[PDB]
Amino acid sequence: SISDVNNAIRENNVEIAPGRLGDLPAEKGQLITIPLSAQGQLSSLEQFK
Amino acid sequence: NISLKSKTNGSVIKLSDVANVEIGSQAYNFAILENGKPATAAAIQLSPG
Amino acid sequence: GATAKTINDSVVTLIERELSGVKNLLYYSATTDTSGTAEITATFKPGTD
């Protein structure tokens, strides 16, 4: 059904929540904090196909 | 004591088994040092006019 | 979601475009951190209430 197509599009093409390695609360002695992100959104016609 | 239904053997596992439950701060963004010792504080800004 | 640009466009750019026409506006500025929130400060002419 069209609901299945919409659900598949929603799942496969999703936006992942960014994060920060070293965020507070943090382990003792940590000295480096770095943002981290992931890409989950499709960008081309072939990918959607 | 919250019970979770395990997915490997079907056993019941307490929430403490997979996590540590404590009472902490809602956010850890800020900290204060009054005279070189820990404390808390709030900044009060005057009303206009 | 941050994206680092959609905050600038359709949120900050669109807001600032409307701000530009504000009555008795001396200038305006905006600050955005890709991690969290966004701020747009409108500074008005001296003597305005």
Please give the residue of chain C at the shortest CA–CA distance from A23: C35
**CB of C24 closer than 8 Å to CB of C36:** no
Q: Could you say which residues from 1 to 49 on chain A have a Cβ atom under 8 Å away from some Cβ of chain B?
A: 24-25
Burial B12-48 (b: 16+ CB within 10 A, else e): eeeeeeeeeeeeeeeeeeeeeeeeeeeeeeeeeeeee
Resolution, given in Å to one decimal, reads 3.2
- In a mutational test of the C interface, the residue from A20, A33, A37, A41 whose CB has the highest number of chain C CBs within 10 Å is A37
Closest residue by Cα to residue A21 from A41, A38, A9: A38
Return d(Cα C7, Cα B42) in angstroms, integer. Answer: 30
Count of A-C CB contacts under 8 Å: 7
